């Protein structure tokens, strides 16, 4: 149908916008602490601690498959990155501190993304 096409164009444009959001968020992680999944070879107990692991490479795979239907779903995954880290790592660690700075810097980006998503529809 023509409606299915129109819906698919909307999704494609959301994906375009979320790709730019993702790039902007990942720049706030210059140490690349959150770039890849926590290695289960190197942290064999991880899944005992963290039930839903997340990282920027995993988000990028979902994004490019157009797997985010709305900004809420994308933000859920970003919040998992931060929140998983802040639980697994102690306050005095470079990992925890990286997550706090990512959260704080990312908020600004996500605030305007939400306006753009609502604005453009």
UniProtKB/Swiss-Prot annotation:
Q: Which domain of life is it from?
A: Eukaryota
Tissue pattern of expression reads: Highly expressed in testis.
What residue stretches are annotated with the Bromo domain?
A: 9-113
Glycyl lysine isopeptide (Lys-Gly) (interchain with G-Cter in SUMO2) crosslink - at what positions?
Answer: 41
- Subcellular location as annotated: Nucleus; Chromosome
Q: What exactly does this protein do?
A: Scaffold subunit of various histone acetyltransferase (HAT) complexes, such as the MOZ/MORF and HBO1 complexes, that acts as a regulator of hematopoiesis. Plays a key role in HBO1 complex by directing KAT7/HBO1 specificity towards histone H3 'Lys-14' acetylation (H3K14ac), thereby promoting erythroid differentiation.
Q: How does it assemble?
A: Component of some HBO1 complex composed of KAT7/HBO1, MEAF6, ING4 and BRD1/BRPF2. Component of the MOZ/MORF complex composed at least of ING5, KAT6A, KAT6B, MEAF6 and one of BRPF1, BRD1/BRPF2 and BRPF3. Interacts (via PHD-type zinc finger domain) with unmodified histone H3. Interacts (via PWWP domain) with dimethylated and trimethylated 'Lys-79' on histone H3.
Q: What is this protein called?
A: Bromodomain-containing protein 1
Source organism (scientific name): Homo sapiens (Human)
**What is the covered span of the full protein?**
555 to 674 of 1058
């Amino acid at each position: 149908s023509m409606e299915q096409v129109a819906m698919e164009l909307r999704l494609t444009e959301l994906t375009r916008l979320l790709r730019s959001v993702l790039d902007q968020l990942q720049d706030k992680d210059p140490a690349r602490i959150f770039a890849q999944p926590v290695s289960l070879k190197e942290v064999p107990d991880y899944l005992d601690h963290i039930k839903h692991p997340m990282d920027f490479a995993t988000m990028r795979k979902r994004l490019e498959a157009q797997g985010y239907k709305n900004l809420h779903e994308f933000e859920e995954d970003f919040d998992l990155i931060i929140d998983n880290c802040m639980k697994y790592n102690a306050r005095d660690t470079v990992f925890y501190r990286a997550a706090v700075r990512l959260r704080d810097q990312g908020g600004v980006v996500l605030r305007q993304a939400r306006r753009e998503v609502d604005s453009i529809g």
